[PDB]
Amino acid sequence: VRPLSVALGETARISCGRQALGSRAVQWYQHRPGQAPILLIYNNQDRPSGIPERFSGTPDINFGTRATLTISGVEAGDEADYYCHMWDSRSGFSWSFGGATRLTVLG
């Protein structure tokens, strides 16, 4: 669990450690301690359910780019764990959810 600190009003950027080999289709899960996880992005290009237009992912165009999730205008309520479920073409079925990161807030 890698920690990462963000101050108020800034723009946060979270990247998962696993790197894809081919066509990727990632899912970004937000899990608050004690509550059920909330799905943010499912097809790496669009948000699954209506949420504030603050979380954005990178599309899968011109293979060679990493997978990053950006959050503009972060508030105090954005304190939860982030899971980067990776799905590629040269690895088969993916069972592990990957190593989660710990977002900390300054102020």
């Epitope: 081919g22 289709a25 899912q27 799905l39 499912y42 097809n43 359910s49 799905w87 073409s89």
Partner: nanobody, 132 residues
Framework: QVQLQESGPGLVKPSETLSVTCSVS????????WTWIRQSPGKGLEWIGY???????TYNPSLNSRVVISRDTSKNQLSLKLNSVTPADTAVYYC??????????????????????????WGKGTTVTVSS
């Protein structure tokens, strides 16, 4: 809209069967997949298995296949039973639904595509403990 509820005993003696039930209200079992996921304190999330209308109980290869999941449409619920429980298996369980999609990257007649699953609706889950 879909509503999901969960139920479990909570206190089970080790080396016995641990059964947890998950019921659905509002919608039927027409086109809704099901899946279970456990989370133990100190470790991350762990996907254990999923089931659908195909009776294909596919389990995690890192689990020794010691759990069975069933779903009866008469009572309109599913339930998972893990046999030979270990006292070190104290974890919170969640019953969720899954949505399947396909990603295509080449010619379809040759089979150049792959399926993926995404959980959209979740539940509160039960916290069960096992001790002597």
């Amino acid at each position: 809209q879909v509503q999901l509820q969960e139920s479990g005993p909570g206190l089970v003696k080790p080396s016995e069967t641990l059964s947890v039930t998950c019921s659905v209200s509002g919608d039927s079992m027409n086109n809704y997949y099901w899946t279970w996921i456990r989370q133990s304190p100190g470790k991350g999330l762990e996907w254990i298995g999923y089931i659908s209308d195909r009776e294909s109980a596919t389990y995690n290869p890192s689990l020794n296949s010691r759990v069975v999941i069933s779903r009866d449409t008469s009572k309109n619920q599913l339930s998972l039973k893990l046999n030979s429980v270990t006292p070190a298996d104290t974890a919170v369980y969640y019953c969720a639904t899954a949505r399947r999609g396909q990603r295509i990257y080449g010619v379809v007649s040759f089979g150049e595509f792959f399926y993926y699953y995404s959980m959209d609706v979740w539940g509160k889950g039960t916290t069960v403990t096992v001790s002597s």
